[PDB]
């Protein structure tokens, strides 16, 4: 049902935004961090506190109104993580690596994820432990079974609320997202080094094999992210997730559709 | 089979294929039994629930032939989009895992991993290789028959079809590069105690299944076979015991109709 | 606004420079090093010394003024850039902590950041802090009136890289929302044991042209180079750690471009 | 080894398939694919490694169909190796952490195979040409190995005396020899060495990857006296026994080589 | 000025490493590493200091025609020698095998029509270098960053310590160079061999290094990592580098 790209004056636009991370924000002073991790809980008695759980970030961007078809088509995205050099602060609150040494860098398990779509990101739920008791204010797989630990097709959600869908509960659903592009990399392990690139010269092309990008339903663009950079280690040895915001610059064109 | 032109017609099929890590009880779906070792190659009797197995599913397709004469039509697998499902579940460092140190978070899943998928017009063809030819494998497993010391390198007697779900242990079998004329397979083994899992998800990645002559796997008996193994690494309990953790694999296969000579 | 490339005799020029690192320079013998790192300062009492904070390096390169009174502008088309002295890290005999009894010195290793930019105006920078309550020392330029939101994205923290050895690397990143008139490239690798990995070759050129074939255009006849090359931490025999930095070379090809006024 | 005439005629294709066994030392009948436990000399002056402790290059010569009815003709035909598909066989066998392995910690699983590894193959129309290089020129190598003759301290860097054909299976120690880049005009070789005690093995399998054997002029290895030469070394790393002893583990390598008939001057 | 391409020739060289060679039996190794307690008392011994390798390769005299270097094939020689874990090795644990060569490494080559141009940079300007080494003259604290005084030609084999000198990106108009440094005590060596890999030496204008006084210069440094003795002492290990260079005749005026 996709016809010609529409050219003419005002047939192209670009939108930009910064999406803040949602790492748990355990107090008024620790925006961008989670609560300290509390660990070794039997699978039968696993009740994570809300502020310990990083969640997916999401925002809707309104686009100039079109007449109902003409739709905005997302063609490219430029994206990077904002503030990566903040991790060179080894003087603030971090455990000394040895006597007389500097602080321990942020490191360990990390996840870097973004999506651009013409509708909210479609998610599939998978749990480490289907018996986890998730706290009020989170949205997690509803009424999970043992099969929820591998693949349970009942756990479908839209990423339709910021700071609500825990990263550990949800992945982008590859059986859906017909009208979105998503990219993520998970790296797990205690000593994993964060590796992050910035440049204003890199572009991701969002067109499929037929040269069609995401088409923006009701003239709205949806951006999604999760940038868990790794764990911060306090002098006590406690560990907290650290997250950073993500920048998006999306170029769109008008597309004719039936 | 003499392959003629593409019939201009197209369908997509999809499958979420569950991993078969052993499933030691009703609550540990996706995990193996704790890993336990024989002191010796001569007394090596692994329990069934400790052995991850290859996953496989048969996707039935409709017959395309009005007449069972001359030229026939077969379904041809052209592309696959595939992804491991639930990679973010490893960000749960609060459930059951050993502290990395006092007052620290849980130990991440890490260690030896294997990520493998195949798409074929017939069951995956496999070649047996053993770490230890004297391993005594348990009832419910299908493992190399009458193994010899040569079974630890290459014994051409060990040929099998991946013809049963949750029966062929990953440690005993590999895709056979000498066969699989009618399938495409892809795997990476990463070995070691502290190996970081590195997993990517994107709906922009497509594997083309066409060979040098532009022919994909042909569904000879109107069935398509998807095969997987996704051992993500070892989960370490508070106690120090270790268990394999596996994740489901999604498949989306584009098929077209291919004319062939009767 | 942007028109024809002025093609002709005298229409091209190459400029080169070596930009020194600004790692803190704690005394005149330790040029290229920071002061030893402090640690475990509660977030509420974190007052880093100036000499402990590596800063962005920057130079303004004046170009011939092509305008008496349509205008002509210098356009940056390519850059060749290299970190200088990477082999110095093979010196494991100067003041190293031994890796064990009878063993060699501990190499420089750990968190590193390799960054450069070429632009026709100062680099546009965005402030982000590990700890908004950090009290930065005199002679540094850091986010003004920071809040908890400064630990994520706070759009108040916009600055020009307009002073050498003033903008701490830990406080500032290139702003992806600006820098229309510059090209920047950085990689951050974090961790205690990260191996430095550095390449040299005189066969690598970066094209600075955007999609419409236009390079950075030198406003007020100035070319701006910027860098940060934190190689990792040097560990003394005492066990103290210090940032080590190296200089960065730039060779930029420029051409004359016609623009409208 | 299977030699299949895929096509007859001027556009004849022959596919040669084979599985080359590793030669890790095989210290007893039950430990096929392993070396003898590694033992280190105190120093360079009394370094006498045991035969079964030294992995060796694998090689085989595959005879091909005769092409030339008239040995008298102005032109003769040679088999030309155009492509190879290759992979290491049994990589998943390293997921066996239950057999004979050292616990990683109390109550933990077995230690995986890991550490220094070398993955190498060659396809040629004559034996692989090798150059000798030694860690320690004063090593006394055991009966059954072929190692550099009358080595000097210059043998620890480059000694042009140490030239050899890989002309015997399970005889040329991997630690003594490398492919010679000054020769091998009629072979293609590929190898990666990764050193260190915690190095993770990383091995890929696919039936979709083809290496093209043609040079810049579009010419593959030419099989002299109707002979195709395969060579390999696949040291996966070290297996650690419950005792703490370490042995090399090796795996077999599959080859599928596609050959065509090339006319050359008699 | 470079005119038309005029036929072809090939030269090859096995260039030995210069790791220090602390005695007649330890060719390809350095002296054991020692550390000064302090930057003010840093006097390394000559045999402890790996140096750049170089060789001048004489070319057929012509006649202006000049030899132009078009492609190079290069390979580090003897990488499998590191599978010897039986010779003088420290055990990784009780009953375990020997500790492999690992740690900081540098792999570098250059092909030019004249000697390689170098820039000096020091970790420690106050280092006192020994007789037989050529190191930056009148070093200052600026020698730890960029000091434009420190220019040299790689004109002597086994004289210019790797730790004092880099290729000069502001010069070398008539050479191509390539180097990777990987730092850290547990870095694994990763080395590839193949006779299918060629580096083209032509610039964007199609011109390769032109050989002055009918001479070709090859330069290398191949520090593979540290060898650990059973005592726990550590020595650099180096390996030879092969070069095969294809050259064509070029008319100058
Ligand atoms: Cl749900
Ligand atoms: Cl069997
Ligand atoms: Cl500000
Ligand atoms: Cl010899
Ligand atoms: Cl000098």
Author numbering:
A (entry chain AAA): 33 to 100, 107 to 296
B (entry chain EEE): 32 to 39, 43 to 102, 104 to 297
C (entry chain BBB): 33 to 101, 106 to 297
D (entry chain DDD): 32 to 297
E (entry chain CCC): 33 to 38, 43 to 99, 107 to 296
Give verbatim lines from the article.
BK polyomavirus (BKPyV) is a small, non-enveloped, double-stranded DNA virus with an icosahedral capsid formed by 72 capsomers, where a capsomer is an association of a pentamer of the VP1 protein linked internally to a single copy of either the VP2 or the VP3 proteins. All variant VP1 pentamer structures were globally similar to the WT VP1 pentamer with a doughnut-shaped ring composed of a central pore surrounded by five VP1 monomers in 5-fold symmetry.
The E73Q pentamer structure was almost identical to that of the WT (RMSD in the BC loop region, from amino acids 68–76, of 0.5 Å), whereas the E73A mutant presenting an alanine in the same position showed some structural changes. Specifically, the S-shaped curve of the backbone structure between amino acids 72 to 75 of the BC2 loop appeared to be flipped over in two monomers out of the five. We therefore refer to this conformational change as “BC loop flipping. In 293TT cells, the E73Q variant was as infectious as the WT, while E73A and N-Q variants showed 3-fold lower infectivity, and VQQ variant was barely infectious.
